[PDB]
Amino acid sequence: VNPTVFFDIAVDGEPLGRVSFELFADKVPKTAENFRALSTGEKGFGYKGSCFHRIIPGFMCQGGDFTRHNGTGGKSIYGEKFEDENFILKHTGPGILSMANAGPNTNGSQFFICTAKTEWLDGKHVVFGKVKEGMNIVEAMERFGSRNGKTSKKITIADCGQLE
Structure with a gap:
């Protein structure tokens, strides 16, 4: 029942591989739906063609700023920002997909893929998904x-959409 979204990752235009994420729409429906809709582009804007602007090896890959490409932009399908939905899910290890923000209730479109356990973010960033296939492609991005x-x-999202 949980949707599966994919990115095809390109490096300086050359294909690198595919990452697919499980989104935990059962537990964070509003957050998951934002990411899903930005991945299909069905609202008229989204992640296709955007870049990963920050990658800290042994920490995380951060992307999703599709308006300024540097960590200062992006927007959600609900408006410029939306609330922290809940903090049920924790940052338990590599492959966790969580929301970047700038303080309480400031979620937009930026996210990060954790490549290590990042427990100090628990209760501060909303966890909403997890890499399902292609963790090895995330490690190559690192x-x-x-x-x-x-x-x-x-490092760009050359294509993206929904698989299930």
Whole structure:
């Protein structure tokens, strides 16, 4: 019943591979639906063509700023921001998909894929999904990151949509 979304990742335009996520719509329906709709583009805007602007190896990959491509933009399907839905799910290890924000109830479209357990984010960032296939592609993305988050090559979502 939970939707599955995929990204096809390209590096400087060259295909890298596919990542698919399980979204936990049973527990965070409003948050999951935002990510799902941005992945299909069915509302007229979304992630297709956007980049991962921050990648910290051993920490996380952050993306989803499809308006300014640098961590200062993005928007949700509900408006410029929306509330923290709940904090049922925790940051338990690599592959967790969680919402970036700028304080309480400031979710937009930016998200991060954790590549390590990040328990200090529990109760501060809404967890809403998990990598289902292609964790190895996420690990390959990590090798283009750096300590300060700048990427050595442009990492883009070349295509994205819903599988189930």
